[PDB]
Design a protein around this ligand. Structure first.
Ligand SMILES: [Ca+2]
Ligand SMILES: [Ca+2]
Lengths: 139, 64, 97, 647, 68, 107
């Protein structure tokens, strides 16, 4: 990220010929694997963290490690900054390697686990109607 | 009324006099524990461009 | 050339050297042929350096055959690479041997 | 031996014999080290070091054998205790001048002992052969300095002659004896200053060096940096004695003078009334964002930090003038560079290892420290009967209870772990797991540390190796709330494997602690495995009575499945009734299993006998309003006063 | 001398001589504070000496000497 | 019965009694002449108490019949020595020993 930072255009060209002369299936298999778990805000661990708050190094749930989660997708963005017409097609059909991974489809399905998550944090909080501090900081 | 005005006295007295007053060796142990969590993590760390400027100074570069 | 083909098939693979466990009593049995000793010695030296499971098969009777090779043949340093590879494994030191 | 230079086979076979004299006596075989002191015979080791015509390999042989006979059992015990920094705070420990305005003066820390046995041949040899052989150090520690000065101040003309045939065998096993002589607690300040003029002058470090000789020098400076960190940490504790005594009173007296001339607690006592450690961040976090806070900013200005420049100049110069292969040299060159730019982060990762103890408990922590490395050196080897004597003497020691954050910081809940995982690739486990169950009870937050290996520990249930998993959850409440479902899910999978027994009574006894843990059930763990155990199999009036005739196996497996199902009952309040779907589980425990309790409540205690009724009466007292007070009355209390004179 | 006996008898609820955590919780939940269990266990074990856990009569008197 | 050959004469009359320490400098070898032990090598004069069953019985009995300054060439019997078990690493099973012992001081 701190190398591709402004949407650098030589670095998106070095990081593409390397995916085509040293033909890596393991890169794209890792990237769909890295977004496999990666996060979700879950309220099941929040209620126990809320129930313990009644009678007892905190915040260890938070969005299930968001700092890796923003940084993985911000890195995925910067491979397409400046509208690369090839990195928007070498993330979908992947004509070089044998097995093709569809990251564009796969990065939709992470978001769908964040829609259903933060809708469900609404419904737990939909009735109390008064903001608590640890309901702000986790939302 | 007047009976519970000492109930605030005795209950808060339990957490009054020992506050690193009773243990000696567990206080110096606890002082450095607090010292390493606030007072140590400072920000002298603006070396990070002097170093990488001095690593790319020539063969093959020290950074390479 | 039959013994060097055996030594090549094991030398890198640790998993292969584990499956050379049970056959080890037969190789050291054949050690006293005195014409094929240079094959089995380099095979066994390319076994004990690899997997610690084959280090546990060697009992007191198996070492004294390797000691007895040294008396009948004398100045052979490749025997002392086996016994150097026998009393210390990868990291741990088998204090029985 | 000098005529061996022209005899190729007779040189190589005596090289590869000196490798066997060292591979046999390696990692502390103190009986064999006393045996090769007869074939190697010490006053010729002093000869073979000084001789400048001995061949290329055989110089490296006799150096690497001297180290692995007399020295390198004690020198490795001062490399396990390199990153502990536990330090007594007796009277002279405050006498550190803290930065006198690597040749250190005091170094008052608590590093291990050395003991040397005289290698003779007598009839008490089991008492002798337990440490090491000795050979005179005052001869050697002066000899290797004149062996250095004869090397560098003569070798600077860059001859084609030198001692080993190349310049590798001249300088590699001379530094390697020089290195492992530095660590062993010798080379006092009359010799440290005498030897630093060879490297610093402020010269060996500015010479021309090959690769695997300059690798040894990287491990020489990397001890000199970790000799200053030992001085800085010993300077902080010299400062943190009076500064905590000028805060034990000045805070507390104003916490007492104010709270004598006040009664209530509006804010004057409430301002610092909290946890003791959290109050320590309160009084010491305020000084940078009074009178005592005019002492820190002088010291934290002078705990900035010479040789930090000449390291970071040379280790970047060496990478300039060469294309350096052997990538263990490159990595060892850059860790020593980066430590010079980050002196803070190395000083960060020492403070979660240090500790302070008084002068009276000095006499027992060293016997722990001596008996800890014996546990710790046994990690890499009927090799076990030293561990059991070692583990037992830790527990019978004084300082194992009274400083249980020190013993959490030496790492010995993971040392005994790594001993255990070796054995579980028999009688060792039952003295390994008995140490952990004694370990979880001495402190609350200690139990939190041991919790993290629970995800491994459940894969190792033998028949004890599950008691560690039980006593990690047992009494505390937060950890009982902390575990998820697939931790519990693998347990009740295994009970389906017990659809044949006696190993069901021990799987369930863990599941009691995950759901009850304080006197009242935990609600989320209540709603789990009963949501699982519907889909598992495990009339039952026929089984509970016929086991009296058969004899305590199925008699108590069902007399503990009941006590499991009694804890994971919702409440004894209207939290049971007036709630949502918590009444649904109230019906499952009475409709999947009908009551039929007459097999349990009366017949069992009339001759196992008292407890199986006590397990059955709890399941009655949770899931199961005045006529029933009379029907079950006088059950069992017929033998109450009957056997009363048979105590 | 005797009013601290009266505060002890108000604090004592079960008649056992050892004040457990539960009575401190039931007087704290009506006093004006909302604590955790660790702080409440501390307010019985901050003056802890031997491992009895509960605060008994003589250390309560010698602690009452250390306030009033 | 062990073979005690005197080499140098000491003074003869002042002999070590039972219940004393024996300052000995000694060098031991096998029958073949190979040297397995010394005390000139490690450079410490050996010391031991008579009768406490510390040093072997051949060494003890041969150190009994000496005096101050007298040196002896004990040829000890293997059955009074380490025996058929010998010593694992240094002494072979059932080999005779040749000690050159020399007393220096007593108590
Ligand atoms: Ca009570
Ligand atoms: Ca008590």
């Amino acid at each position: 990220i701190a190398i591709l930072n402004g949407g650098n255009s030589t670095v998106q060209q070095k990081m593409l010929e390397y995916l085509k002369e040293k033909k890596d299936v393991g890169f794209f298999q890792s990237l769909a694997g890295l977004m496999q778990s990666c996060s979700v805000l879950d309220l099941n661990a929040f209620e126990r963290q809320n129930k313990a708050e009644g009678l007892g190094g905190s915040g260890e749930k938070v969005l299930q490690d968001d700092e890796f989660t923003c940084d993985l997708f911000r890195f995925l963005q910067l491979l397409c900054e400046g509208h690369n017409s090839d990195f928007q097609n070498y993330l979908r059909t992947q004509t070089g390697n044998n097995t093709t991974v569809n990251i564009i489809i796969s990065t939709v399905d992470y978001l769908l686990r964040v829609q259903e998550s933060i809708s469900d944090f609404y419904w737990y909080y939909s009735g109390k109607d008064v903001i608590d501090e640890q309901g702000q900081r986790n939302f | 009324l007047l009976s519970k005005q000492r109930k605030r006295a005795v209950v808060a007295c339990f957490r009054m006099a020992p506050l690193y007053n009773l243990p000696r060796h567990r206080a110096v142990n606890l002082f450095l524990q607090g010292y390493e969590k606030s007072w140590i993590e400072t920000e002298e760390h603006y070396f990070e461009d002097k170093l990488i400027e001095d690593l790319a100074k020539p063969r093959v570069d020290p950074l390479h | 050339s039959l013994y060097e083909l055996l030594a090549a098939l094991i030398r890198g693979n640790r998993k292969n050297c584990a499956q050379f466990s049970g056959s080890l009593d037969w190789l050291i049995s054949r050690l006293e042929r005195l014409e094929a000793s240079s094959g089995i010695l380099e095979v066994l030296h390319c076994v004990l350096v690899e997997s610690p499971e084959a280090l546990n098969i060697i009992k007191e009777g198996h070492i004294k055959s390797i000691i007895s090779l040294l008396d009948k043949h004398g100045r052979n340093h490749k025997v002392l690479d086996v016994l150097c590879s026998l009393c210390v494994c990868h990291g741990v030191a088998v204090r029985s041997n | 031996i000098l005529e061996l230079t022209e005899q190729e086979e007779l040189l190589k076979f005596h090289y590869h014999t000196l490798r066997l004299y060292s591979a046999v006596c390696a990692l502390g075989n103190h009986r064999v080290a006393h045996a090769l002191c007869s074939h190697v015979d010490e006053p010729q080791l002093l000869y073979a070091i000084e001789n400048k015509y001995m061949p290329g390999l055989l110089r490296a042989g006799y150096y690497d054998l001297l180290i692995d006979i007399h020295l390198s059992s004690y020198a490795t015990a001062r490399l396990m205790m390199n990153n502990e920094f536990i330090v007594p705070m007796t009277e002279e420990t405050k006498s550190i001048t803290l930065f006198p305005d690597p040749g250190i003066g005091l170094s008052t820390s608590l590093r291990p002992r050395m003991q040397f046995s005289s290698p003779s041949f007598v009839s008490i040899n089991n008492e002798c052969y337990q440490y090491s052989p000795e050979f005179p150090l005052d001869i050697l520690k002066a000899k290797t300095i004149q062996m250095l000065t004869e090397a560098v101040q003569e070798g600077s003309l860059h001859a084609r002659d030198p001692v080993g045939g190349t310049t590798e065998f001249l300088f590699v096993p001379l530094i390697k004896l020089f290195y492992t002589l530095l660590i062993m607690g010798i080379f006092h300040n009359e010799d440290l200053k005498h030897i630093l003029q060879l490297i610093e002058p402020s010269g060996l470090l500015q010479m021309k060096l090959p690769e695997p000789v300059k690798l040894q020098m990287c491990l020489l400076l990397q001890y000199l940096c970790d000799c200053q960190v030992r001085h800085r940490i010993e300077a902080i504790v010299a400062f943190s004695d009076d500064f905590v005594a000028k805060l034990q009173d000045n805070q507390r007296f104003r916490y007492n003078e104010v709270m004598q001339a006040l009664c209530p607690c509006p804010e004057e006592i409430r301002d610092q009334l909290l946890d003791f450690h959290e109050d320590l961040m309160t009084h010491c976090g305020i000084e940078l964002d009074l009178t005592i806070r005019g002492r820190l900013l002088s010291l934290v200005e002078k705990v900035t930090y010479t040789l930090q420049q000449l390291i970071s100049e040379t280790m970047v110069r060496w990478a300039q003038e060469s294309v350096i292969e052997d990538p263990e040299l490159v990595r060892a060159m850059f860790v020593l560079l980066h430590r010079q730019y980050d002196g803070i982060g190395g000083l960060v990762r020492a403070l979660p290892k240090t500790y302070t103890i008084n002068g009276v408990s000095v006499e027992d922590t060293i016997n722990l420290l001596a008996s800890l490395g014996q546990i710790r050196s046994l990690l890499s080897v009927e090799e076990e009967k030293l561990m059991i004597r070692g583990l037992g003497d830790i527990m019978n020691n004084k300082v194992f209870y009274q400083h249980p954050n020190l013993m959490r910081a030496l790492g010995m809940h993971e040392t005994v772990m790594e001993v255990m995982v070796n054995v579980l690739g028999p009688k060792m486990v039952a003295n390994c797991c008995r140490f952990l169950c004694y370990f979880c009870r001495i402190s609350r937050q200690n139990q939190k540390a041991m919790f993290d290996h629970l995800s491994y520990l459940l894969e190792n249930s033998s028949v004890t190796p599950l008691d560690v998993a039980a006593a990690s959850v047992m009494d505390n409440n937060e950890l009982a709330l902390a575990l998820r479902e697939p931790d519990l899910e693998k347990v009740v999978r295994y009970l389906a494997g017990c659809g044949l027994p006696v190993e069901g009574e021990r799987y369930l006894d863990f599941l009691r602690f995950a759901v009850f843990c304080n006197g009242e059930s935990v609600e989320e763990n209540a709603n789990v495995v009963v949501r699982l155990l519907i889909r598992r199999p495990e009339g039952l009036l026929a089984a509970m009575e016929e086991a009296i005739k058969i004899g305590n196996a199925i008699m108590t497996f069902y007399a503990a499945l009941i006590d499991l199902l009694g804890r994971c009952a919702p409440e004894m309040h209207l939290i049971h009734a007036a709630k949502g779907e918590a009444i649904r589980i109230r019906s499952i425990l009475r409709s999947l299993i009908p009551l039929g309790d007459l097999v349990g409540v009366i017949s069992i205690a009339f001759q196992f006998c008292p407890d199986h009724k006590a397990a059955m009466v709890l399941f009655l007292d949770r899931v199961y309003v005045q006529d029933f007070l009379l029907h079950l009355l006088e059950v069992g209390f017929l033998p109450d006063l009957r056997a009363a004179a048979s105590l | 001398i005797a009013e601290f006996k009266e505060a002890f008898s108000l604090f004592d609820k079960d008649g056992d001589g050892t004040i457990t955590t539960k009575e401190l919780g039931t007087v704290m939940r009506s006093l004006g504070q909302n604590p955790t269990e660790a702080e409440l266990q501390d307010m019985i074990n901050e003056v802890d000496a031997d491992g009895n856990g509960t605060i008994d009569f003589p250390e309560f008197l010698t602690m009452m000497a250390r306030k009033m | 019965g062990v073979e005690i050959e005197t080499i140098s004469p000491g003074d003869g009359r002042t002999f070590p009694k039972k219940g004393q320490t024996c300052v000995v400098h000694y060098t031991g070898m096998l029958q073949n002449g190979k040297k397995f032990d010394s005390s000139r090598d490690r450079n410490k004069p050996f010391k031991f108490r008579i009768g406490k069953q510390e040093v072997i019985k051949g060494f003890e009995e041969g150190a009994a019949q000496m005096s101050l300054g007298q040196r002896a060439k004990l040829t000890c019997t293997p059955d009074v020595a380490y025996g058929a078990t010998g010593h694992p690493g240094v002494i072979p099973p059932n080999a005779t020993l040749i000690f050159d012992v020399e007393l220096l001081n007593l108590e």
